[PDB]
């Protein structure tokens, strides 16, 4: 995620990092993998997404 904004106005623009990469992708890989836990615990979200 590259950010180079012309005209100095010190505005972080942390939207990119917090739009996909950064946390969420790291916290997801922090501990062990998943194996069987993903095919469920993750798909157990659709049981919620439905309603």
């Amino acid at each position: 995620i590259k950010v180079r904004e012309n005209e100095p106005f010190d505005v972080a623009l942390r939207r990119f990092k917090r739009s996909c990469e950064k946390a969420g992708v790291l916290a997801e890989v922090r501990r062990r993998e998943f194996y069987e836990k993903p095919t469920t615990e993750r798909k157990r979200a659709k049981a919620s997404a439905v309603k």
Binding site: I1, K2, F16, S19, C20, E21
Partner: protein, 55 residues
């Protein structure tokens, strides 16, 4: 979406990070999404597109 050399089209189906955009966001059909993914993937391999931002 059907061809890979058509980088001009695939760029629309890719975020700013380089990863292809989800199907729900774009709205595009699933059948088409799959066909797109393949074109995009092989396109990146021919250095016609980026993998991420760094390289």
């Amino acid at each position: 979406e059907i061809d890979y050399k058509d980088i001009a089209t695939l760029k629309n189906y890719i975020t700013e990070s380089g990863k292809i955009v989800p199907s729900r966001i774009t709205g595009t059909r699933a059948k088409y999404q799959r066909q797109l993914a393949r074109a995009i993937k092989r396109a990146r391999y021919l250095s016609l597109l980026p993998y991420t931002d760094r390289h």
